Design a protein around this ligand. Sequence first.
Ligand code: YKH
Ligand code: ZN
Ligand code: ZN
Length: 232
Amino acid sequence: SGEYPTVNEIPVGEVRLYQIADGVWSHIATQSFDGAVYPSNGLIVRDGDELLLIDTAWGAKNTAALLAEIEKQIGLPVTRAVSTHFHDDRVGGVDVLRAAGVATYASPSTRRLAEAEGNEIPTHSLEGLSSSGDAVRFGPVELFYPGAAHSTDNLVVYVPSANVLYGGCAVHELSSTSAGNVADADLAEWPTSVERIQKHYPEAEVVIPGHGLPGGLDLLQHTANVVKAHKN
Ligand SMILES: COc1ncc(-c2c(C(=O)O)[nH]c3c([C@H](C)N4C[C@]5(C[C@@H](CN)C5)OC4=O)cccc23)cc1O
Ligand SMILES: [Zn+2]
Ligand SMILES: [Zn+2]
């Protein structure tokens, strides 16, 4: 009824939307992995009379439910999607999107890693993001490659009209103890990558993590702290 939804409030298979700013929503879904249930976020950004989707809802059935929730709550078509790294919480559901007419995009690095791991593969490659600090425009957002962090390919997304920074899984929520699932992470480079984000987006007003509650710019410093301490 208004606060940001949490893992035990969303059955696996349902999707919630949360209005972040004018023309900006997050999507929240839950999924089982290795016998535990986790929430995860993505983003929806209005692009005129169309929508840009950032990240799937972590699976085919969740992503079908996402599209249905968008139709119910917003009623504009999703025409493009960007996946911010290669893991299933970001690309799982790309096949559903592709068959619903959505053009799916990711960096070449994400596409190669997704293919090598057996995850679903976005159709279109996003050039211009291969060096840390690179930024490109994509409809109503800026895509930024901060360097290796949670994964080597992780992208972040800024919505300049609303000063919304979507950090994806390179950014942790404030209740995060612990650096999340670090299987593919670069703990040594992660603080440097976060510092690049902090330098590039000093006017961010909302910061959305890949999992958990949005907050302000403090999420970035918190993430650096938790990664440094996990390493320690
Ligand atoms: C305590 O809180 C939290 N705990 C954990 C997470 C969390 C994150 C995140 O840290 O982004 N990702 C998760 C994934 C994704 C799909 N996977 C799986 C994978 C293992 C590799 C294959 N061997 C690929 O690497 C990866 O990230 C699954 C399950 C949980 C998470 C988030 C939390 O908030
Ligand atoms: Zn991940
Ligand atoms: Zn994640």
